Amino acid sequence: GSHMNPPPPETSNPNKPKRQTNQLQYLLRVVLKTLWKHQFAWPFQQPVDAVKLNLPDYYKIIKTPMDMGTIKKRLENNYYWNAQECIQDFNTMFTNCYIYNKPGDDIVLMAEALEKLFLQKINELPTEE
Ligand SMILES: O=C1CC(I)=CC=N1
């Protein structure tokens, strides 16, 4: 837990209003579950440790970090009000990967595979009830 990594994104805050929606339940039970178990999930399952990876410029470049471990905790802790907040977290995670890394890098190929699955799952996001 190096001082050279930033504090991870918030996953708990009693002041933030929270809700469970059928769409959020789908995001946890279907979307996150699908991506979390994938062969290529591991680079995305926790915040980037820039010290362990020797990437001193990572948090110079990436000012909006997000990862699936944070998303998992947000969903498990019912942090969100709506599905769009969670979808935006997934989109931020993918975009950070694409911004920092070169096209065709292994991590990008991995992100692209997960993003394809994500798109399919979000196209099937249920009507809010
Ligand atoms: O599912 C996995 C396990 C291992 I070790 C490496 C990559 N994906």
UniProtKB/Swiss-Prot annotation:
Effect of D106G: Found in a patient with a neurodevelopmental syndrome; uncertain significance
Superkingdom of the source species: Eukaryota
Location(s) in or outside the cell: Nucleus; Chromosome
UniProt tissue specificity: Ubiquitously expressed.
Record location of the Glycyl lysine isopeptide (Lys-Gly) (interchain with G-Cter in SUMO2) cross-link: K60
Membrane-spanning parts: none
PTM info: Phosphorylation by CK2 disrupt the intramolecular binding between the bromo domain 2 and the NPS region and promotes binding between the NPS and the BID regions, leading to activate the protein and promote binding to acetylated histones. In absence of phosphorylation, BRD4 does not localize to p53/TP53 target gene promoters, phosphorylation promoting recruitment to p53/TP53 target promoters.
Subunit field text: Interacts with p53/TP53; the interaction is direct. Interacts (via CTD region) with CDK9 and CCNT1, acting as an associated component of P-TEFb complex. Interacts with RELA (when acetylated at 'Lys-310'). Interacts (via NET domain) with NSD3, CHD4, BICRA and ATAD5. The interaction with BICRA bridges BRD4 to the GBAF complex. Interacts (via NET domain) with JMJD6 (via JmjC and N-terminal domains); the interaction is stronger in presence of ssRNA and recruits JMJD6 on distal enhancers. Interacts with NSD3. Interacts with NIPBL. (Microbial infection) Interacts with bovine papillomavirus type 1 regulatory protein E2. This interactions may serve for the tethering of viral genomes to host mitotic chromosomes allowing successful partitioning of the viral genome during cell division.
Family: Belongs to the BET family.
Clinical note on disease: Cornelia de Lange syndrome 6: A form of Cornelia de Lange syndrome, a clinically heterogeneous developmental disorder associated with malformations affecting multiple systems. It is characterized by facial dysmorphisms, abnormal hands and feet, growth delay, cognitive retardation, hirsutism, gastroesophageal dysfunction and cardiac, ophthalmologic and genitourinary anomalies. CDLS6 inheritance is autosomal dominant. A chromosomal aberration involving BRD4 is found in a rare, aggressive, and lethal carcinoma arising in midline organs of young people. Translocation t(15;19)(q14;p13) with NUTM1 which produces a BRD4-NUTM1 fusion protein.
Domain notes: The NET domain mediates interaction with a number of chromatin proteins involved in transcription regulation (NSD3, JMJD6, CHD4, GLTSCR1 and ATAD5).
Protein name stated in the entry: Bromodomain-containing protein 4
Gene that encodes the chain: BRD4
Parent-protein residues present: 44 to 168 of 1362
